[PDB]
Design a protein around this nucleic acid. Structure first.
Lengths: 244, 198, 111, 170, 183, 115
RNA sequence: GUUCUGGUAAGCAGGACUGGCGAAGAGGAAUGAACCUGGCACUGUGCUAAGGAACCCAAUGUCUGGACAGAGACCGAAAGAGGUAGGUGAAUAAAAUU
């Protein structure tokens, strides 16, 4: 038989199955469309959540059809979040090729000198290492392997991305000695221009002012607070049954 | 026979007719590679094809969609599933047979040089009347979310380059040898080697 | 290596065919007889000229016996396939395999 | 294939040759038994002699010559049984024999009206000259004015798979 | 079943025509047009200063397609010796319609239809160009291709009518007044 | 393109020798004079026959505006005089076949050194 | 299966005649107590039935007409127009047409 009265569903099926995220650090998985008509620029960055406060702003927004003569100005109180963004350092690049199975990576190329903070991500336990990690790679600069590598990237690639890490040693409250590593896409110009722009900047520091400015719209990707195992009343919002 | 391989150019064949011939070979031990899956032809208007495909997407497992049917959206994979159900795939003999088959949209670089076979009985211009409509599988599959059309257009342009280069490279050797072999300097040594084999 | 030589010797002198099924109806199988197709033989009239000829299945990876002998008994159907009998029953695992046709006749008792 | 036969027969009672008449019937059929069957059918419907009082004295086949396979025009008068009633009509055909003409009618009505061959009856077969032709269909072919090209392709070889660079059709 | 069907079109003094496969291409004073007949089963060729279509042993509905093919070819030839035109006329009982031509005659804007405050924008298909007529209420379209010209005119007529009003009281519109070849 | 009209020269399905069309019956059948040869001892035979058009391939035209059967037999025996059932390599004895093979095989060894 | 009586009917209730399943396997209708072929001790070689012959799956092709509807091969009524293939009977005709 049909149910007696109509009502909406509890919770959205767009988020089922609701399983736990695998690790706490997110990759940007989707990037805005490239346009060859513009200069070479970066498309993303990493940040740390500090906390919240509130502000008062002035406003003058009203219906275009509102017949009121006076240029009314009004105070509005708003809540805001603060994020800390120290400069990231560039340490390598990756090229990709388009196939019937999507984008696949061709080769990765690293800077001649790498920092202790970034090498620390490559080992599991910080305090127990022989530190023989990248010690043989610098020969590839002498041998011309680097110059052969750039040729292959420049010859056969559709998309180019840089590798950047964050300077965790500047934020002591994190209690963290391993940097976080992110792969960031370059839009604008041609493949050759993109590669030259990257090559000029390995080992250097890019400030956040390169990427974003005031009044801009941005997308924020993150992992939510954890709450453990929970019942249906809190997980999906269903009503509590009769008291007896 | 086990140990024989065959490469098929799929263009201009009617899908359900080629699939029957291919499936018989897989059961006899041949390894088959199909190339150009996006160019196979179906008969009738495209309008009818669209409705048959809509009725297929509607099918799903009621209690758990991750068990239910998987609706494949690539020309290569679609033609693979047409061949799959003309084999005994619920049993080991069919599962062995299936692993001998590969299907590609376009022509990959490892198969440009290899000589290629064709099936005259299944070509559209033999097996159907001229006065009725048809469509390509590549034309139907863009409407249900295939995303690699442009990648295949770029491949198709590399093939044309290779065809013109190889034909130009061949015609010169044909001319060279045929002009050479009329000469006395050639026809002399015929005798010089035969003196030692007669 | 004797196996590599024994193959080349056989390749130079025999016609080639493949094993594809036992004699069967829609429901039942008769594993005493097997069905073969021969390379370029494509009519029943063409196929009749092979009735009586010897056949051999050679299997080098075998630990027991390196080859099985048999004889072609009859034509089967209208497109040039044949029926044959061997000294032992052919396993379902051996379907799809290559068979050699030996260009001389033998008696049903010899196998 | 269809053939032409002529059957002859008399009446008998408890004693022989009870009438001095002999009856004849020309028929198109596949064999002699189908011919004899027709003779019995017509006798019982146009007279009233049932088989037990009949005897067939002769059956003969009728055959033409036409060593050069010359092509001729024929007109045929026929009827057939449908679900409603019996339908009469006339049609014209071309061929190398009366039997060749008759086999083409039987095929035609089966195609156009969904009738098995035993429900069709031939009344008359006549050979005609160019001035006699009534309907539109055959006149252009009779006046010798037709040429056309080939619409159907033809296979070159019996092999199932062939190399891409070979010639495939005709 | 028809035994034989033939249709013929004559190529005028200035014109030149070629046939590659089933694509037929035409050149002449006003420019070039081409059309592909690969979707019809027919045999097309050029013979003694004519374009010739043929079929043998065909059904009733196949010969209709042959004839249709022959009429389209004539329109291509005619359009190449002189182009076609279409004439539009604005009609109103209260609110005067006004027209703007932009982008060298590739864009038309309409304003004030039935007192509506929002504008409407229409784009010219293919070779076509839009021009002002004898009084402010008239527009003229001119082009090589009868298809492209007539399709454009139709789109304007079909959009510029009343909606959800009684059309025999509210008679305002933009109507196709005249059509033909240019002199 | 060729046409099916009296005097067209045709081949039949899976056959090497030419034959000729004599009369046209309807939009799908014709009367032909057909040539064939018994490989058992070179015994030829030519005879008339009714055939459907889906089994024949046109290749050319001749006159025969008016001729008798015996005349057209003459036309046909001249036309296909040059043709054969099989490549001679399969018909000759073993030693002759090997002698013919050597010529080709030696010629390659020359060309591969000379090129 | 062929027929009959009661009932709007029913895989409903109740009779008559000739074979079945009960107490009947085997091959075929994808599957099915009763339908098609056809009645069983135990082996070996040949041949046919019913039903099949692109592929699943042992064996498949040919000729002539129809038919375009995500139709049909599996499938509902009284009532009907449209498209196309043919028959017969009326006209008119300075190609034909109704």
């Amino acid at each position: 038989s049909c149910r007696n009265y109509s009502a909406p569903r509890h919770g959205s099926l767009a988020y089922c199955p609701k399983k736990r995220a695998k690790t706490t650090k997110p990759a940007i998985k989707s990037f805005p469309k490239d346009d060859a008509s513009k200069p070479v620029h970066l498309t993303g960055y990493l940040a740390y959540k500090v906390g919240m406060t509130h502000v008062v702003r002035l406003s003058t927004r009203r219906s275009k059809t509102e017949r009121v003569l006076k240029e009314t100005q009004k105070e509005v109180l708003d809540a805001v979040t603060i994020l800390e963004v120290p400069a990231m350092r560039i340490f390598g690049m990756v090229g990709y090729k388009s196939t019937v199975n999507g984008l696949k990576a061709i080769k990765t190329v690293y800077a001649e000198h790498l920092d202790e903070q970034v090498l620390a991500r490559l080992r599991k336990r910080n305090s127990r290492s022989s530190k023989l990690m990248f010690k043989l790679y610098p020969q590839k600069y002498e041998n011309g392997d680097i110059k052969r590598d750039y040729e292959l990237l420049k010859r056969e690639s559709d998309v180019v991305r840089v590798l950047a890490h964050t300077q965790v040693s500047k934020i002591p409250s994190l209690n963290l000695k391993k940097a976080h590593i992110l792969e960031i896409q370059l839009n604008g110009g041609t493949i050759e221009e993109k590669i030259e722009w990257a090559i000029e900047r390995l080992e250097k520091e890019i400030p956040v002012s390169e990427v974003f400015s005031q009044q801009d719209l941005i997308d924020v990707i993150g992992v939510t607070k954890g709450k453990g195992k929970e019942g249906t009343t809190k997980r999906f919002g269903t009503t509590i049954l009769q008291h007896k | 026979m086990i140990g024989k391989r065959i490469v098929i150019d799929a263009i201009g064949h009617v899908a359900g007719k080629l699939a029957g011939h291919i499936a018989k070979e897989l059961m006899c031990g041949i390894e088959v590679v199909i190339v150009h899956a996006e160019n196979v032809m179906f008969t009738g208007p495209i309008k009818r094809g669209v409705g048959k495909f809509n009725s297929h997407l509607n099918k799903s497992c009621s209690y758990n969609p991750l068990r239910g049917p998987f609706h494949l959206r690539s020309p290569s994979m679609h033609l693979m599933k047409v061949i799959k159900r003309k084999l005994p795939h619920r049993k080991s003999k069919g599962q062995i047979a299936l692993k001998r088959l590969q299907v590609f949209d376009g022509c990959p670089t490892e198969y440009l040089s290899v000589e290629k076979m064709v099936c005259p009985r299944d070509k559209l211009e033999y097996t159907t009347s001229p006065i009725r409509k048809s469509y390509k599988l590549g034309d139907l599959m863009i409407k249900f979310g295939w995303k690699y059309e442009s990648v295949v257009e770029k491949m198709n342009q590399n093939e044309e380059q290779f065809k013109i280069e190889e034909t130009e490279k061949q015609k010169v050797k044909e001319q060279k040898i045929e002009e050479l072999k009329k000469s006395n300097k050639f026809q002399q040594r015929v005798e010089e080697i035969m003196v030692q084999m007669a | 290596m004797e196996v590599i030589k024994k193959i080349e010797l056989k390749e130079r002198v025999c016609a080639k065919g493949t094993l594809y099924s036992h004699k069967r109806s829609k429901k039942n199988i008769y594993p005493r007889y097997s069905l073969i197709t021969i390379e370029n033989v494509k009519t029943r009239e063409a196929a009749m000229k092979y009735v009586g000829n010897a056949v051999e299945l050679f299997k080098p990876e075998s630990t027991k016996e390196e080859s099985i002998h048999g004889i072609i008994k009859a034509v089967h159907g209208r497109s040039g396939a044949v029926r044959a009998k061997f000294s032992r029953n052919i396993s379902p695992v051996e379907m799809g395999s290559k068979v050699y046709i030996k260009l001389y006749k033998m008696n049903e008792d010899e196998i | 294939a269809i053939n032409e036969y002529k059957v002859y027969g008399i009446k008998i009672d408890d004693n022989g040759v009870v009438g001095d008449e002999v009856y004849a019937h020309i028929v198109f059929a596949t064999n002699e038994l189908l011919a004899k069957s027709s003779f019995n059918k017509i006798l019982k419907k146009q007279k009233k002699i049932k088989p037990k009082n009949t005897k067939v004295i002769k059956v003969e086949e009728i055959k033409e010559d036409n060593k050069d396979l010359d092509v001729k025009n024929y007109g045929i008068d026929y009827y057939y049984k449908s679900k409603r009633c019996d339908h009469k009509g006339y049609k014209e055909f071309r061929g190398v024999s009366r039997c060749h003409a008759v086999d083409k009618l039987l095929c035609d009505i089966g195609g156009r009206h969904s009738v098995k061959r035993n429900l069709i009856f031939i009344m008359k077969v006549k050979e005609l000259t160019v001035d006699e032709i009534k309907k539109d269909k055959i006149k252009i072919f009779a006046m010798e004015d037709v040429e056309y090209p080939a619409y159907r392709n033809v296979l070159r070889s019996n092999k199932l798979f062939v190399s891409e660079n070979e010639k495939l059709f005709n | 079943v028809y035994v034989y069907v033939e249709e013929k079109v004559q190529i005028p003094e200035g014109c030149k025509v070629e046939v590659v496969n089933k694509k037929v291409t035409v050149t002449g004073p006003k420019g070039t047009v081409s059309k592909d007949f690969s979707h019809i089963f027919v045999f097309i060729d050029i013979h003694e200063e004519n374009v010739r279509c043929r079929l043998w042993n065909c059904r009733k509905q196949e010969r209709s397609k042959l004839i249709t093919c022959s009429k389209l070819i004539k329109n291509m030839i005619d359009g190449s010796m002189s182009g076609y035109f279409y004439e539009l006329k604005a009609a109103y009982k209260h609110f005067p319609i006004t027209f703007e031509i932009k982008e060298n005659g590739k864009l038309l804007i309409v304003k004030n239809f039935l007192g509506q405050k929002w504008a409407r924008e229409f784009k010219m298909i293919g070779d076509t160009i839009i021009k002002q007529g004898v009084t402010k209420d008239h527009l003229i379209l001119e082009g090589i291709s009868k298809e492209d010209v007539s399709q454009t005119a139709g789109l304007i007529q079909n959009n510029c009518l009343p909606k959800n009003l009684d059309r025999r009281i509210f008679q305002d519109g933009v109507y196709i007044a005249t059509k033909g070849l240019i002199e | 393109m060729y046409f099916i009209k009296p005097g067209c020269l045709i081949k039949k399905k899976f056959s090497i020798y030419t034959s000729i069309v004599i009369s046209v019956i309807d939009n799908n059948s014709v009367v032909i004079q057909s040539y064939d040869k018994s490989d058992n001892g070179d015994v030829i035979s030519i005879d008339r026959e009714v055939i459907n058009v889906s089994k024949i391939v046109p290749i050319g035209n001749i006159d025969i505006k008016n001729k008798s059967k015996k005349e057209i037999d003459g036309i046909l025996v001249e036309e296909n005089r040059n043709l054969k059932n099989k490549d001679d390599v399969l018909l000759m004895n073993d030693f002759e076949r090997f002698k013919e093979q050597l010529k080709k095989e030696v010629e390659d060894m020359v060309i591969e050194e000379m090129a």
